[PDB]
Each structure stands twice: as structure tokens, then as C-alpha cells.
Scaffold this motif. Structure first.
Motif, PDB file in Angstrom:
ATOM      1  N   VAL A  38      -6.913  -0.527  -0.831  1.00  0.00           N
ATOM      2  CA  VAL A  38      -7.467   0.200  -1.981  1.00  0.00           C
ATOM      3  C   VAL A  38      -8.275   1.419  -1.512  1.00  0.00           C
ATOM      4  CG1 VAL A  38      -9.059   0.113  -3.953  1.00  0.00           C
ATOM      5  CG2 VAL A  38      -7.500  -1.806  -3.530  1.00  0.00           C
ATOM      6  N   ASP A  39      -9.068   1.235  -0.457  1.00  0.00           N
ATOM      7  CA  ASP A  39      -9.922   2.263   0.135  1.00  0.00           C
ATOM      8  C   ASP A  39      -9.083   3.392   0.691  1.00  0.00           C
ATOM      9  OD1 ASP A  39     -12.211   0.760  -0.414  1.00  0.00           O
ATOM     10  OD2 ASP A  39     -12.576   0.170   1.666  1.00  0.00           O
ATOM     11  N   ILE A  40      -7.963   3.072   1.354  1.00  0.00           N
ATOM     12  CA  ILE A  40      -7.084   4.103   1.904  1.00  0.00           C
ATOM     13  C   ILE A  40      -6.374   4.885   0.808  1.00  0.00           C
ATOM     14  CG2 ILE A  40      -5.130   4.531   3.419  1.00  0.00           C
ATOM     15  CD1 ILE A  40      -6.045   1.961   4.922  1.00  0.00           C
ATOM     16  N   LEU A  41      -6.173   4.267  -0.368  1.00  0.00           N
ATOM     17  CA  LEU A  41      -5.583   4.961  -1.512  1.00  0.00           C
ATOM     18  C   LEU A  41      -6.604   5.831  -2.279  1.00  0.00           C
ATOM     19  CD1 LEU A  41      -3.369   2.046  -2.755  1.00  0.00           C
ATOM     20  CD2 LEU A  41      -2.548   4.262  -1.932  1.00  0.00           C
ATOM     21  N   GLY A  42      -7.875   5.768  -1.893  1.00  0.00           N
ATOM     22  CA  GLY A  42      -8.962   6.541  -2.486  1.00  0.00           C
ATOM     23  C   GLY A  42      -8.662   8.000  -2.743  1.00  0.00           C
ATOM     24  N   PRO A  43      -8.243   8.777  -1.734  1.00  0.00           N
ATOM     25  CA  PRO A  43      -7.933  10.195  -1.982  1.00  0.00           C
ATOM     26  C   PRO A  43      -6.905  10.421  -3.081  1.00  0.00           C
ATOM     27  CG  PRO A  43      -8.152   9.773   0.359  1.00  0.00           C
ATOM     28  CD  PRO A  43      -8.075   8.438  -0.308  1.00  0.00           C
ATOM     29  N   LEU A  44      -5.874   9.566  -3.134  1.00  0.00           N
ATOM     30  CA  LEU A  44      -4.827   9.701  -4.140  1.00  0.00           C
ATOM     31  C   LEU A  44      -5.323   9.292  -5.501  1.00  0.00           C
ATOM     32  CD1 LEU A  44      -1.807   8.396  -2.010  1.00  0.00           C
ATOM     33  CD2 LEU A  44      -2.503  10.786  -2.513  1.00  0.00           C
ATOM     34  N   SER A  45      -6.150   8.239  -5.563  1.00  0.00           N
ATOM     35  CA  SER A  45      -6.752   7.835  -6.824  1.00  0.00           C
ATOM     36  C   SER A  45      -7.688   8.970  -7.322  1.00  0.00           C
ATOM     37  CB  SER A  45      -7.570   6.562  -6.623  1.00  0.00           C
ATOM     38  OG  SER A  45      -8.114   6.170  -7.871  1.00  0.00           O
ATOM     39  N   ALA A  46      -8.414   9.630  -6.406  1.00  0.00           N
ATOM     40  CA  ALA A  46      -9.347  10.697  -6.769  1.00  0.00           C
ATOM     41  C   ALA A  46      -8.596  11.912  -7.301  1.00  0.00           C
ATOM     42  CB  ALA A  46     -10.216  11.079  -5.567  1.00  0.00           C
ATOM     43  N   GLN A  47      -7.529  12.322  -6.610  1.00  0.00           N
ATOM     44  CA  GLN A  47      -6.716  13.467  -7.000  1.00  0.00           C
ATOM     45  C   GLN A  47      -6.080  13.299  -8.377  1.00  0.00           C
ATOM     46  OE1 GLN A  47      -3.963  14.668  -3.893  1.00  0.00           O
ATOM     47  NE2 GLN A  47      -2.789  16.002  -5.271  1.00  0.00           N
ATOM     48  N   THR A  48      -5.428  12.175  -8.620  1.00  0.00           N
ATOM     49  CA  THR A  48      -4.725  11.933  -9.879  1.00  0.00           C
ATOM     50  C   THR A  48      -5.562  11.378 -10.999  1.00  0.00           C
ATOM     51  OG1 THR A  48      -4.077   9.677  -9.280  1.00  0.00           O
ATOM     52  CG2 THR A  48      -2.620  11.477  -8.559  1.00  0.00           C
ATOM     53  N   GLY A  49      -6.724  10.840 -10.683  1.00  0.00           N
ATOM     54  CA  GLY A  49      -7.577  10.242 -11.699  1.00  0.00           C
ATOM     55  C   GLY A  49      -7.064   8.902 -12.180  1.00  0.00           C
ATOM     56  N   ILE A  50      -6.086   8.290 -11.457  1.00  0.00           N
ATOM     57  CA  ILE A  50      -5.531   6.994 -11.838  1.00  0.00           C
ATOM     58  C   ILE A  50      -6.120   5.977 -10.907  1.00  0.00           C
ATOM     59  CG2 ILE A  50      -3.490   5.502 -12.008  1.00  0.00           C
ATOM     60  CD1 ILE A  50      -1.941   8.224 -12.458  1.00  0.00           C
ATOM     61  N   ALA A  51      -6.966   5.085 -11.445  1.00  0.00           N
ATOM     62  CA  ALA A  51      -7.632   4.046 -10.672  1.00  0.00           C
ATOM     63  C   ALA A  51      -6.601   3.184  -9.942  1.00  0.00           C
ATOM     64  CB  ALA A  51      -8.493   3.192 -11.584  1.00  0.00           C
ATOM     65  N   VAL A  52      -6.888   2.795  -8.707  1.00  0.00           N
ATOM     66  CA  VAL A  52      -5.930   2.025  -7.888  1.00  0.00           C
ATOM     67  C   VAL A  52      -5.432   0.767  -8.599  1.00  0.00           C
ATOM     68  CG1 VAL A  52      -5.488   0.810  -5.707  1.00  0.00           C
ATOM     69  CG2 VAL A  52      -6.724   3.002  -5.681  1.00  0.00           C
ATOM     70  N   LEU A  53      -6.334   0.053  -9.304  1.00  0.00           N
ATOM     71  CA  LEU A  53      -5.911  -1.142 -10.029  1.00  0.00           C
ATOM     72  C   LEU A  53      -5.036  -0.815 -11.239  1.00  0.00           C
ATOM     73  CD1 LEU A  53      -8.987  -3.470  -9.545  1.00  0.00           C
ATOM     74  CD2 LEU A  53      -6.804  -3.566  -8.382  1.00  0.00           C
ATOM     75  N   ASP A  54      -5.192   0.380 -11.830  1.00  0.00           N
ATOM     76  CA  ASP A  54      -4.287   0.818 -12.897  1.00  0.00           C
ATOM     77  C   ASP A  54      -2.922   1.090 -12.294  1.00  0.00           C
ATOM     78  OD1 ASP A  54      -6.662   0.805 -14.349  1.00  0.00           O
ATOM     79  OD2 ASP A  54      -6.437   2.860 -15.123  1.00  0.00           O
ATOM     80  N   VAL A  92       0.825  -1.203   0.000  1.00  0.00           N
ATOM     81  CA  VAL A  92       0.000   0.000   0.000  1.00  0.00           C
ATOM     82  C   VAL A  92       0.866   1.263   0.000  1.00  0.00           C
ATOM     83  CG1 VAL A  92      -0.341   0.091   2.503  1.00  0.00           C
ATOM     84  CG2 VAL A  92      -2.049   1.114   0.957  1.00  0.00           C
ATOM     85  N   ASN A  93       2.010   1.212   0.697  1.00  0.00           N
ATOM     86  CA  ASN A  93       2.978   2.318   0.752  1.00  0.00           C
ATOM     87  C   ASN A  93       3.683   2.552  -0.544  1.00  0.00           C
ATOM     88  OD1 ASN A  93       2.158   2.378   3.410  1.00  0.00           O
ATOM     89  ND2 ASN A  93       4.231   2.117   4.242  1.00  0.00           N
ATOM     90  N   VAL A  94       4.096   1.483  -1.235  1.00  0.00           N
ATOM     91  CA  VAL A  94       4.719   1.628  -2.554  1.00  0.00           C
ATOM     92  C   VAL A  94       3.702   2.298  -3.521  1.00  0.00           C
ATOM     93  CG1 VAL A  94       5.754   0.505  -4.544  1.00  0.00           C
ATOM     94  CG2 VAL A  94       6.284  -0.336  -2.237  1.00  0.00           C
ATOM     95  N   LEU A  95       2.445   1.837  -3.517  1.00  0.00           N
ATOM     96  CA  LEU A  95       1.404   2.439  -4.360  1.00  0.00           C
ATOM     97  C   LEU A  95       1.208   3.892  -3.993  1.00  0.00           C
ATOM     98  CD1 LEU A  95      -0.984  -0.610  -4.308  1.00  0.00           C
ATOM     99  CD2 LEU A  95       0.208   0.314  -6.339  1.00  0.00           C
ATOM    100  N   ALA A  96       1.242   4.208  -2.680  1.00  0.00           N
ATOM    101  CA  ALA A  96       1.069   5.594  -2.242  1.00  0.00           C
ATOM    102  C   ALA A  96       2.188   6.478  -2.789  1.00  0.00           C
ATOM    103  CB  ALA A  96       1.024   5.681  -0.726  1.00  0.00           C
ATOM    104  N   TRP A  97       3.415   5.971  -2.747  1.00  0.00           N
ATOM    105  CA  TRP A  97       4.613   6.647  -3.239  1.00  0.00           C
ATOM    106  C   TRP A  97       4.583   6.780  -4.779  1.00  0.00           C
ATOM    107  CZ3 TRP A  97       8.436   3.882  -5.943  1.00  0.00           C
ATOM    108  CH2 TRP A  97       9.635   4.554  -6.181  1.00  0.00           C
ATOM    109  N   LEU A  98       4.002   5.811  -5.476  1.00  0.00           N
ATOM    110  CA  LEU A  98       3.813   5.915  -6.925  1.00  0.00           C
ATOM    111  C   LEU A  98       2.830   7.044  -7.236  1.00  0.00           C
ATOM    112  CD1 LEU A  98       3.837   2.252  -8.070  1.00  0.00           C
ATOM    113  CD2 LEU A  98       5.654   3.942  -8.380  1.00  0.00           C
ATOM    114  N   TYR A  99       1.781   7.213  -6.419  1.00  0.00           N
ATOM    115  CA  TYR A  99       0.877   8.347  -6.562  1.00  0.00           C
ATOM    116  C   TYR A  99       1.622   9.668  -6.295  1.00  0.00           C
ATOM    117  CZ  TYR A  99      -3.342   5.663  -7.267  1.00  0.00           C
ATOM    118  OH  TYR A  99      -4.330   4.884  -7.819  1.00  0.00           O
ATOM    119  N   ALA A 100       2.444   9.730  -5.238  1.00  0.00           N
ATOM    120  CA  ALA A 100       3.268  10.906  -4.932  1.00  0.00           C
ATOM    121  C   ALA A 100       4.162  11.257  -6.119  1.00  0.00           C
ATOM    122  CB  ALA A 100       4.119  10.658  -3.705  1.00  0.00           C
ATOM    123  N   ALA A 101       4.697  10.229  -6.805  1.00  0.00           N
ATOM    124  CA  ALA A 101       5.557  10.403  -7.967  1.00  0.00           C
ATOM    125  C   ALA A 101       4.769  11.057  -9.114  1.00  0.00           C
ATOM    126  CB  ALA A 101       6.114   9.064  -8.405  1.00  0.00           C
TER     127      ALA A 101
END
Ligand SMILES: Cc1ccncc1NC(=O)[C@H](C)CC1CC1
Ligand SMILES: Cc1ccncc1NC(=O)[C@H](C)CC1CC1
Lengths: 304, 304
Positions: free
Chosen positions: B247-263, B202-211
Motif C-alpha cells: 500500500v505504501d509503495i502505491l502511495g505516489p500513484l494513489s496521490a497522483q490519481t486521488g484514488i485511495a489504494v483500498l478503493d 501490488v503490480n496489478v494495482l500499479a497497472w490499474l493506476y497506469a490505466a
């Protein structure tokens, strides 16, 4: 054991952070003794930032226009002056939390901690290096201007940086505490060339010594090199040329580990020419350059 | 813009650090209200550490044997008690610098800042994650025991860790502030198995969103995946299985970037299967897992 990208304890700096507002712009100020230091662009509006005439903009401002707030208490501004790109707001009260401090201009390749702030409130602290090209790769959003960089030697805080700007490339530029920019930068919303950056060679070697001290030794080889041969490789890989002054500063680490500086240079040469081969050093998959030889000695000995 | 491994401002914690000495051992204590918390192994000598009988060792100690020093002032110890692996030394003076605080037991994968101290004096601050196997990869030398980990929510410090031990592998183990070890560890100088560690997905995905937020986008691809397909890859690469809660905790980041968590999971799958190809993401050449989705949101919005 273990080796981390450690920042200085930020407590002494937290006690100096204030919020400065002028017109509709709010940013951070540094309150030391009876003076508040902040980026002069606090006096600008959106129309001004493309090419501000700071002298003219400051003439329209009076002491009562600078709103300085420390936590929740208001400071009374009794003077204002511009020194280079900083404003110095003289206040009627000396900061009771002023630590022992110095203003220093750091050299490129030197490291420091940044206390990122917004609205005069600290959000986080991180360690970084001043790039050879005088930029810093920080983490700053709008409102972080006026956040400062510093080093701490026992009880003395040496303030070395004040954040002013984000270049169109996403890298950061700022000044020393006398308001002199590091590098060729001007405080204008204009595209500005940052020089070609290089990797800080003495720092990478210092970090390779930190790696050996902590057990990561796979990169040690049976080779040696010379300053001339190493600098030919450094040139090709955009590394700063190594000088005898850099070798001399690595002396304590060479003495502790028993690995001659030129032998460590041969390990670095092999890593540059062959890469890591999917391996890591101190949890990094690249050659780290944000630790000076002094940082390594301090962390490896537990200096407080 | 920019994204850094940011620690919390350590000021509120610096004001709680004290030095605790018992016999010939000195380590750090945490002074909150009229109580000083420290690792119970402060009462041990070299002969004891292989298998200390803490109850028997503590019986030989009296209040006057615990030397507690805050900066340069001595605290008077009026009580002592052992709770799990911590000692609680009741003092006659409440710490005037006690911030609003809570003791929390963090979950594996959660992050926190460590204020490394020696002799009750702070040396540095760094951010780290509690590994899925309950160890931390910190930077601690002899004398750093009693240094604490914490998170800060506005004015409240949530203390989550106290350093106790370095395993023979060079990784670190400690307790919550009630003295309960994270993981299977015991406070004995004995070889102890740390479980198989995994990468915090979940942290790696979060950091990919930060990227993506900060401009590093080269890893975004034309693919998608499912939780099942992704978890087959996570299994092979020793990554923690992703759940809908992640996936639910990554919601805000998925919403901000428009990149679906599974993408984003499909980008992570491609990076796991193909590596970085000598490229970097947010200045790292590996997949970073020490940023939670909350850390990313906080840093990306400038929360103070
Ligand atoms: C927006 C931002 C985000 C991070 N850091 C700094 C900023 N501010 C700026 O760069 C302003 C435009 C500087 C002024 C021209 C002098
Ligand atoms: C030496 C050191 C370096 C870093 N961190 C911690 C330490 N101390 C220890 O591990 C002692 C032996 C713990 C005691 C058995 C309970």
C-alpha cells in the motif's frame, strides 16, 4: 520455448540520439553521419501549434538557433533545411557511432521497435505495429518527439518512424525519415480523424502459429475454411481481408507445424465467433496482432 | 499517454556480451572489467547434464579450453573459477565498454529487462517479472544461456539475472550474478517442481493506476474494501496477499490519481469476481502483473 513481445537491441540507435533545442522547445534528434534529423515542430511556440506556417517560422531561424547536444557535447550546426515535416541540421562532425543504416517507409501491419527518448536520453524500448490506419499505439509523453522506430537486419538499422504527435484520442502519429507522415496526419494541434482501424489478420495467424510451436494448442480444431468464407468472418469482426500474398508469407510457419494456412484460418474463425472462453494463448486473453510472420520465424529460430 | 511493456535501453548490456565455448558447447558470457561470467553448464556434454559433477568436470578444464570471443576478437583467459552455478573467467583485458554496474539479487515480483543473446550476439530485448515462484516466463532457445536480466538507474546497470535453464514446463530458471539460483532449481536436466505461482497483486494495482492515468477508467466503481476483505478475495484467486508495505509503495500513484489504494483494491476485487466482461484495460484482456509501482511512475513521468 516461450514467446515474448521482443524489441530489437537498441544499442545502435542509442548512439544516434541527440537533444535538439530551438527557442524554448526541446525534443530528440537522430544524428546519422553529419546530419541531425528531428521533427520540424521544434521551431514552434504554443501560439503557433494550432496552425503553424512552418516555412515562415523556419525563416526566422538561423543555424546558431538550433542547439544540438549529444550526451554532454555540443554539435556545431552548419546548415538547416526542411524536408516535408522533418528538419535536417547539417553538423560539422559525423557521428562516430553511426551504424550501417537505411531509411525505409514501412507498410501498415509491419512491426518495429521504438526507442522512447526525452531530452536526447533513451528511457525505454518497446515493440509495436504500424496500425492499418497508420497510427501507432505507443507510449509517448511531451518531450518524446523525435524518438524513432526501427528494424535491424544483422548490422543494418532500417529507420522507419519518427514520432511527431499525439492525437486527441491518445494514439500516436509520425513520419518516415524523409518527414512524410504515415496516414492523413498533419503536424498541427488540431483534432484529426484516424481511419477505421482493423486487426492485422496475417499477424494474428502468425501468432497462432507461434502459439502452436510453443505448446498452446487448445484452439486447434477439426475444421477448415476457404479464403472467401474466412474473409466473410474477417469482415464481420473488422479484420483485414486475407490474401494469397498473406498465405504465401505464412508458408514457412505452415511448413514447420504441418498446419495448413486455411486450417489455421478455421481456428481463427472459431476464436472470433466464440471468443477464448476465459482461456489464454501465449499469456494473452485477446488475439494478438503485433507479430509479423517474419517476427515469429526470427524469434522461433533465434536470429541475431 | 499510452502505456507499454517497456524494456530498458539495452546498449550498455550489448557492449558486455561475449560468446563462451568449452568443448562443443557455446553459450553467452557477460564481460565486465577483466572478468567473463557465464553459466557453469558450458563445461558439460550431453551425457553429463542428467547429473553433472561440476567440480570434477571443471578440473578437466584449463584456461586455454575456454574460448571467449567478443564480436570477432578473442579474449585471453588467464584464470577460471566456479562460484555457485557461474564460472568467472579472468581475462587479460578489461572490457572498454564496461558500464557502471552492480550485481543485485532481485525479489520475486520485481521486474527486469532481458537481453536475449545467441553466440554472444544480441537478438532482442523484453521486459518481464521474476514470478513469485522464482521462475521467469521468457523467450529462450538453446544457445540463449548466459543471457542476462537487468535494471538501469541513469548510468548504472544492476545485473540481476543470468539465464541457465528451461524447465520441462517451458518456464525459465536462472541465477543472480554470484551464480545462486532464484528458487529451488538445480542446473541439471531433471524434472523440477516450480512452486505454486501467484499473481503479483501490488503490480496489478500499479497497472490499474497506469490505466486510470492513461484514460481507461471503466473498472472504477463506487466501492471500497479493507486489506482483510481484499486478502480473502486474493486468496481465492491465487493473488499474493497485499500488505501495508505494498500500500505504501502505491502511495505516489494513489496521490497522483486521488484514488485511495483500498478503493483501487475494490475495483480489483470486482474485476476478479466478475472478469472483464469482454472489455480491455490498456490493450489487455487480463490483469497484467509485470509492471511494478516504480515502473508505472517511471513510464508515466518519462524517466531517462
Ligand atoms: C504532447 C505530446 C505527447 C506525446 N507525443 C507527442 C506530443 N506532442 C504533440 O502532439 C505536439 C502538440 C505535436 C505538434 C503539432 C505538431
Ligand atoms: C535447451 C534450453 C532452452 C532454453 N533455455 C535453456 C536451455 N538449456 C537448458 O535448459 C540446459 C539443459 C540446462 C542445463 C542443465 C543445466
Amino acid at each position: 520455448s516461450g514467446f515474448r513481445k521482443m524489441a530489437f537491441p537498441s544499442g545502435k540507435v542509442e548512439g544516434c540520439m541527440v537533444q535538439v533545442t530551438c527557442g524554448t522547445t526541446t525534443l530528440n534528434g537522430l544524428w546519422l553521419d553529419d546530419v541531425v534529423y528531428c521533427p520540424r515542430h521544434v521551431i514552434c511556440t504554443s501560439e503557433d501549434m494550432l496552425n503553424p506556417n512552418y516555412e515562415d517560422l523556419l525563416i526566422r531561424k538561423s543555424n546558431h538557433n538550433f542547439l544540438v547536444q549529444a550526451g554532454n557535447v555540443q554539435l556545431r550546426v552548419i546548415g538547416h533545411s526542411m524536408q516535408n515535416c522533418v528538419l535536417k541540421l547539417k553538423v560539422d562532425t559525423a557521428n562516430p557511432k553511426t551504424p550501417k543504416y537505411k531509411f525505409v517507409r514501412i507498410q501498415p501491419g509491419q512491426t518495429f521497435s521504438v526507442l522512447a527518448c526525452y531530452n536526447g536520453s533513451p528511457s525505454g524500448v518497446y515493440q509495436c505495429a504500424m496500425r492499418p490506419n497508420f497510427t501507432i499505439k505507443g507510449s509517448f509523453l511531451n518531450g518524446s518527439c523525435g524518438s524513432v522506430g526501427f528494424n535491424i537486419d544483422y548490422d543494418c538499422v532500417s529507420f522507419c518512424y519518427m514520432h511527431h504527435m499525439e492525437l486527441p484520442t491518445g494514439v500516436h502519429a509520425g513520419t518516415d525519415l524523409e518527414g512524410n507522415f504515415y496516414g492523413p496526419f498533419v503536424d498541427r494541434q488540431t483534432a484529426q480523424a484516424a481511419g477505421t482501424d482493423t486487426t492485422i489478420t496475417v499477424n494474428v495467424l502468425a501468432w497462432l502459429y507461434a502459439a502452436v510451436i510453443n505448446g498452446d494448442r487448445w484452439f486447434l480444431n477439426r475444421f477448415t475454411t476457404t479464403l472467401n468464407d474466412f474473409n466473410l468472418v474477417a469482415m464481420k469482426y473488422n479484420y483485414e481481408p486475407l490474401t494469397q500474398d498473406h498465405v504465401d508469407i505464412l508458408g514457412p510457419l505452415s511448413a514447420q507445424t504441418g498446419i495448413a494456412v486455411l486450417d489455421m484460418c478455421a481456428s481463427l474463425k472459431e476464436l472470433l465467433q466464440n471468443g477464448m472462453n476465459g482461456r489464454t494463448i501465449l499469456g494473452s486473453a485477446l488475439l494478438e496482432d503485433e507479430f509479423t510472420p517474419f517476427d515469429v520465424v526470427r524469434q522461433c529460430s533465434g536470429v541475431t
